[PDB]
A paper describes a structure:
The DNA repair factor CtIP has a critical function in double-strand break (DSB) repair by homologous recombination, promoting the assembly of the repair apparatus at DNA ends and participating in DNA-end resection. An important mechanistic advance came from the demonstration that CtIP exists in a tetrameric form, due to the presence of a short tetramerization motif at its helical N-terminus. The amino-terminal domain of CtIP (NTD) is comprised of an N-terminal sequence (nNTD), responsible for CtIP tetramerization, and a C-terminal coiled-coil sequence (cCTD) that includes a zinc-binding motif, with C89 and C92 as ligands. Our data show that CtIP adopts an extended dimer-of-dimers structure, in agreement with a role in bridging distant sites on chromosomal DNA during the recombinational repair.
A double C89A, C92A mutant (Mut) CtIP-cNTD protein was prepared, which crystallized readily and showed improved diffraction properties. We determined its crystal structure at 2.8 Å resolution by molecular replacement (MR), using as search templates two coiled-coil models comprising the strongly predicted coiled-coil regions flanking the zinc-binding motif. The crystal structure revealed that the cNTD region spanning residues 31–136 folds in a highly elongated dimer of uninterrupted parallel alpha helices. Within this helical structure, two coiled-coil regions—named here CC-N and CC-C—comprising amino acids V35 to L84 (CC-N) and I117 to L138 (CC-C), flank the zinc-binding site. The coiled-coil structure of both CC-N and CC-C follows largely the expected heptad-repeat pattern of interdigitating hydrophobic residues. The residues surrounding the positions of cysteines 89 and 92, comprising the zinc-binding motif, interrupt the coiled-coil conformation and form instead two alpha helices running parallel to each other in the dimer. Surprisingly, in the crystal structure, the alanine residues occupying the position of the zinc-binding cysteines 89 and 92 point outwardly towards the solvent, in a conformation that appears incompatible with the shared coordination of a zinc ion. The reason for this unexpected arrangement is unclear; it is possible that the presence of alpha helix-promoting alanine residues in the mutant protein had induced the formation of a local helical conformation, leading to the observed continuous alpha-helical structure for the entire CtIP-cNTD sequence. The loss of zinc-binding in the mutant likely disrupts this hinge conformation, allowing the near-linear helical conformation observed in the crystal structure of the cNTD mutant. Crystals were assigned to the trigonal P32 space group with unit cell dimensions: a = b = 86.6 Å, c = 42.6 Å, α = β = 90, γ = 120, with one protein dimer in the asymmetric unit.
Numbering used by the authors:
A (entry chain A): 30 to 141
B (entry chain B): 31 to 138
Write the structure that this text describes.
Amino acid sequence: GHDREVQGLQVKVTKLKQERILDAQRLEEFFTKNQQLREQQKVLHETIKVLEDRLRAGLADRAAVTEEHMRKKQQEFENIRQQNLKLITELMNERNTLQEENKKLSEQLQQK
Amino acid sequence: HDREVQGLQVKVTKLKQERILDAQRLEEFFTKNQQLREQQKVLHETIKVLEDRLRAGLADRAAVTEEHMRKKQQEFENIRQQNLKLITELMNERNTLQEENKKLSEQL
């Protein structure tokens, strides 16, 4: 009757009011979880910047630092080569002046 | 009970409308939540792709320079031992000429 129908309606109003308390707080949780993901993406973007800065820095630095050593290694070799070339020329000149004198004495003994 | 039962059924339908609207806002927050989830996976995939380019770039520059240090020192040692061989050949020839000259000078 009138009492039962009013009782049934007041129950529906109470149950809906409790669900609205839960729904409003579920929205607040979704908002905080989304803002947490945004601040987490800020950190990941900073990490991407450091990696892209080290891709250009590591490529352009090692390309010039390794050339510094390839250059200085040949300079070491060229100094040794220059010392060896001076030895080769002095010995070749000393040998030629000696070998000419050997044929002069060898033909002198045969003619006599 | 006529103006009261009607007065409650309106409040029920108003509350149901507020829960339907909140259910739509929960769908909006949920879809925006999964979008940021997929964006983080992209950032994680991007970070891993860049970290792999580091390992590939370093192992390449470390192996290319090792090929240069190997072939350069192979050249310098082939040249140096070529000069050592030549210098010793000239020295032995100089010595054997001085011996023969001193022998021939005494023969006369």
